[PDB]
């Protein structure tokens, strides 16, 4: 559940970047393909995003690392499927 | 004259009656004011504003 | 009847012409909710024009603010009335006095926060007794204009409806008197040849009872059968 | 507005009430003495608080 | 061992209101059972009020009938105030036929031997002319609580609000029952004001039955 | 038609979805605040008193 | 249909440590949340059969506002520490216990003698601290069976507020909860601590047994 986002503001200390990081993550869960890193209590993708932020496993650096890993996986998939 | 008219009826002179609570069945401390006010219904009804 | 009034209720309720103040005194000969027939005492009665006064009361009708102006007789049968006395109580009047609201048992106390800033906490005995259940009246017009390619009928047959539309509409298409309608119903069936449904429909959120249907017709346009 | 009246009536005192100057082993039995009908809401008392 | 109360005396002081008496009670249970039974009696009792009315030549409630000095809507409110017992049915449809000048009370209703009118002086309307006559059918049915017209919902069957509730006003007062060589035993005197359709022992017995049904959630009977 | 199954749909679209309540003369930024809805039998917005 | 109610059942018992529990109930008919919460509150908080320490006679103490050397706490504070000592007893109505201990350290109920049918819920519950070796405390602590809270002013002998009922804090929060097509019902939320002489769910079932037995001549 969710009442305040205060710990998520503590771990991403800008309070304006929290919205952007959790929005990037909640778009990775909504359309999205991806599955959450945290157990869901029938919370929506907003609260699951912020709840991932509070326990310190999603920030901007982890999302860019995962997207570089997916870009390398697509690169290896294209190279190993064609050649 | 309000006090004297409240003495003609058998009501307490202060205008205030001790009242119990319908939830808990126990007395409100410090007796409260009960009386009859002429209350009006104004034509600002909520299912013309919703 | 305000229990704590000022005595100026009588003058306001008489002098505003919402009550049927008796013109000539005498004896009640007949009382109905429609009319009141007053036999006149001989001293106030003219030599010719034998004469008994027939007061027609104005029953349930629309005010300017969609409230209901209604007169009810407050005198029985065979009961003496004097000149200047009231006979029919108008809206918000009680035996010739002036009754805007109603008098209720009020406690002054905080009760669990439900009357916080200026709010008011009301029992169910106020809503069971219908002691504020006011009556509103809405006039709704439906017009058969003269347009190009042909005028618009007030027929019953409507494209793309079923039995759930015509079950409330008569042989002529207009709703019956007394039919309880809700939002999204059909009252007057009106069609536009392109044919598109342009029928009168009850506005969203309102209910009610059709109390009256008036039909106005230009001289020359023929009449549908309900007219 | 209502809540400050409820607090100002709650945390206050009077020079004699039910349970004047009795001693209480915690705030839980303070509320238990208020609810059962053995003390008053404002009655000065030594409690043990932590 | 606590002591257990019994209905020790019932004073049917009028046709409307009465006083039941519960004795002996242990100290503390007086206000507990008193508030609980006041809660149940005002909340949930079976009543038999009017539900639908169908007058003769009246389309809807917002009109008048020629030859009665009340509206049809005031007739519906006076029927809403009618109190009536039914015995062997759930719904029943009463009939009223009356001509002649004068008040139409509830005495002009055809009696319908399973149905009992508890107050036959209760005036419905006032017919005002000789050749004026109303003729209505009054649908009385059993219920509970408060069901208005707009929530549960031909053209001639006017719907009135349903107020199925026999009781009006409950007031209980404990007092010391100094008896039995054992003082400090309370005495629950419950005065109940009723329109008439429910005997007071039946009321206090249904109220205690409702509590013993609700306590079944976490004790075994 | 408002059938019996759309109210469960409605309690499953409300749950973690804030709304912006706004009083009509908004003077400072505390006059637009976001809440979570709790559904009301009624026709009036129930607003927490401290707010 | 006039007897058919919405009889509930408890949906969860969201408990904290074994002397505390937060029980809920749904769906209750409108107006039954307050009368069930109130009836069970007044019964659990007013009249529950239990055993408690009632009166204490210390050996060297003649008066409540007295002093004794070698004892950290005071006599008023030692009676505050004896008001919380929670005792269960078999069919014996009242019985005396004796505490004799001298030495440096805390003196708890685990140092009270055990003889009889007395059973203590806490060996850890500290009566009084002691800071010397020759400080000799010796009390005769008298438990007694009763029915709720009996204060000292409504009772060398001392006067302890004997709270016989096992609960400490009980409260209820009737909140709204709906059925499929109903308008408004209730959800009783009992929250209740004990002293440990009975676990909480069995104490609510004791309250239910008492209120269902006080209505046996009617139903």
mmCIF file of N, CA and C in Angstrom, chain B residues 20-25, chain E residues 31 35 38-39 172-173:
data_model
loop_
_atom_site.group_PDB
_atom_site.id
_atom_site.type_symbol
_atom_site.label_atom_id
_atom_site.label_comp_id
_atom_site.label_asym_id
_atom_site.label_seq_id
_atom_site.Cartn_x
_atom_site.Cartn_y
_atom_site.Cartn_z
ATOM 1 N N UNK B 20 -28.177 11.512 26.682
ATOM 2 C CA UNK B 20 -27.376 10.319 26.539
ATOM 3 C C UNK B 20 -26.977 10.179 25.076
ATOM 4 N N UNK B 21 -26.089 9.239 24.804
ATOM 5 C CA UNK B 21 -25.587 8.988 23.467
ATOM 6 C C UNK B 21 -26.235 7.726 22.938
ATOM 7 N N UNK B 22 -26.683 7.765 21.687
ATOM 8 C CA UNK B 22 -27.328 6.593 21.128
ATOM 9 C C UNK B 22 -26.377 5.471 20.811
ATOM 10 N N UNK B 23 -25.103 5.794 20.601
ATOM 11 C CA UNK B 23 -24.096 4.784 20.321
ATOM 12 C C UNK B 23 -23.704 4.021 21.576
ATOM 13 N N UNK B 24 -23.303 4.735 22.616
ATOM 14 C CA UNK B 24 -22.726 4.128 23.798
ATOM 15 C C UNK B 24 -23.675 4.022 24.978
ATOM 16 N N UNK B 25 -24.839 4.655 24.925
ATOM 17 C CA UNK B 25 -25.805 4.536 25.994
ATOM 18 C C UNK B 25 -25.456 5.282 27.251
ATOM 19 N N UNK E 31 -27.276 -1.081 31.794
ATOM 20 C CA UNK E 31 -27.083 -0.180 30.674
ATOM 21 C C UNK E 31 -26.640 -0.885 29.405
ATOM 22 N N UNK E 35 -29.177 -0.343 26.379
ATOM 23 C CA UNK E 35 -28.789 0.274 25.124
ATOM 24 C C UNK E 35 -28.862 -0.709 23.971
ATOM 25 N N UNK E 38 -32.591 -1.134 23.144
ATOM 26 C CA UNK E 38 -33.079 0.088 22.507
ATOM 27 C C UNK E 38 -32.595 0.191 21.069
ATOM 28 N N UNK E 39 -31.339 -0.182 20.837
ATOM 29 C CA UNK E 39 -30.782 -0.219 19.492
ATOM 30 C C UNK E 39 -31.545 -1.175 18.586
ATOM 31 N N UNK E 172 -35.261 3.368 28.449
ATOM 32 C CA UNK E 172 -34.993 2.418 29.509
ATOM 33 C C UNK E 172 -34.353 3.142 30.675
ATOM 34 N N UNK E 173 -34.658 2.690 31.886
ATOM 35 C CA UNK E 173 -34.083 3.290 33.084
ATOM 36 C C UNK E 173 -33.795 2.212 34.108
#
